[PDB]
């Protein structure tokens, strides 16, 4: 039977900023600090004042660059405390669905080669990605002539995402907007293999 | 007794062992600014390993080096499946707390 | 020396962290099982739809031996 060969890639951007501590974790931090003080085994004022003013003079880099934008979905720095996933709008001849970046593959090209091609096929940038294994993460088959789509996985080491204002609709989705943007069951189940954490 | 049907009912040494693509010996090196953080992460990774049924051999440490000091830890790992290695490594990546250096180096 | 109220608060903190990390380990295990079964059903579908690709799906990438990936920070470059 005529089969429509299609692969894909669920790119993963790891969090550059660790998640902020909950008040429960802050209470545990206080408890561990006080037990550490209890278990501890043995002009300072001027030094403390100088060191605290050294702390005060420099402003710490904001852990959240997200509240100011509210519209920069295309920006690579949409979120910092969580993983990000690339997601680009696509328009087919018979369909128009917000679809994870896919690609067409041939039997002369392996799945790893298809993923490596897809790394720069649609973003036209100099992004640096890393692969773990040939094992995929999700498979979804929708027919009209058979077809299949393989959602793979990759991790971003560094990225020179030039011309961020691309003609595409790349919107970085962490966990929540996946259901909002991908309605059909064949595309709303990506969160099963997306690291929700 | 040898002739009796109960022969060998008391043997035990056969139950004691005293001595398909898979990895080899894997060393995870954890260098950290904090003794407490390094120890906690070593405990966490060891718990993950013995909950996922990973043969862990050693959890020793390198000697301290001064040029402040950085504490070093080692986790030994042996036995990985295709998807199992991927899931293990990605869980480690997503569970690294703060400013610690991982490693997948080998022996020697 | 310590008082009774602080000991009770310590016990409550231990209980609440017990519950919190219990939920944490539970959700981590749920993610593990969910994505593992997703990968297994993906492999089964790949075997069913391609008898010549499941043989090369099991092989490992040889670039994982010198693997390296840094963790998170607070202030990005």
């Amino acid at each position: 039977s005529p089969w429509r060969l299609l692969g894909a890639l669920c790119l993963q951007r790891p969090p550059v900023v660790s998640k902020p501590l909950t008040p429960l974790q802050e209470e545990m931090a206080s408890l561990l600090q006080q037990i550490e003080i209890e278990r501890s085994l043995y002009l300072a004022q001027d030094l403390e004042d100088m060191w605290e003013q050294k702390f005060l003079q420099f402003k710490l880099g904001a852990r959240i660059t997200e509240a100011d934008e509210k519209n920069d979905r295309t920006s690579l720095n949409r979120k910092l405390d969580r993983n990000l996933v690339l997601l680009v709008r696509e328009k087919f001849g018979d369909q128009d669905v917000w679809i994870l970046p896919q690609a067409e593959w041939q039997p002369g090209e392996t799945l790893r080669g298809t993923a490596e091609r897809t790394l720069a096929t649609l973003s036209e940038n100099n992004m640096e990605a890393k692969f773990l294994g040939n094992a995929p993460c999700g498979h979804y088959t929708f027919k009209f002539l058979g077809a299949k789509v393989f959602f793979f996985k990759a991790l971003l080491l560094t990225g020179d995402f030039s011309q961020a204002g691309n003609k595409g609709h790349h919107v970085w989705v962490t966990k929540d907007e996946l259901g909002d943007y991908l309605k059909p069951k064949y595309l709303a189940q990506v969160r099963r293999f997306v690291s929700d954490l | 007794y040898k002739t009796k049907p109960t022969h060998g009912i008391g043997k035990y040494k056969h139950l004691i062992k005293a001595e398909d693509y898979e990895y080899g010996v894997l060393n995870i090196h954890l260098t950290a600014y904090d003794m407490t953080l390094a120890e906690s992460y070593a405990q966490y990774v060891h718990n993950l390993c013995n909950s996922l049924s990973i043969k862990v051999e050693e959890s020793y440490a390198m000697p301290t080096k001064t040029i402040l000091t950085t504490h070093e830890r080692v986790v030994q790992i042996s036995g990985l499946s295709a998807t199992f290695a991927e899931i293990f490594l990605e869980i480690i990546q997503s569970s690294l707390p703060e400013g610690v250096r991982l490693s997948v180096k080998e022996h020697t | 020396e310590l008082t009774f109220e602080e000991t009770e608060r310590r016990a409550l903190l231990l209980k609440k962290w017990s519950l919190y990390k219990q939920q944490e380990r539970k959700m981590e295990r749920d993610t593990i099982r969910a994505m593992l079964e997703a990968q297994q059903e993906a492999l089964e579908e790949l075997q069913l739809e391609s008898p010549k690709l499941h043989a090369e799906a099991i092989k490992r990438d040889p670039n994982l031996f010198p693997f390296e990936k840094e963790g998170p920070h607070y202030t990005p470059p």
Binding site: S40, F58, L60 | Y33, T36 | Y74, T75
Partner: peptide, 29 residues
């Protein structure tokens, strides 16, 4: 005693460390 000192290696990545004599700011040259 240990204190939460912020440390930076070469690029400006503040990290909390348990360090004696709370400096609140460290920068490796």
């Amino acid at each position: 005693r240990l204190y939460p000192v912020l440390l930076v290696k070469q690029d400006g990545s503040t990290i909390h460390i348990r360090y004696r004599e709370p400096r609140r700011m460290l920068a490796m040259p």
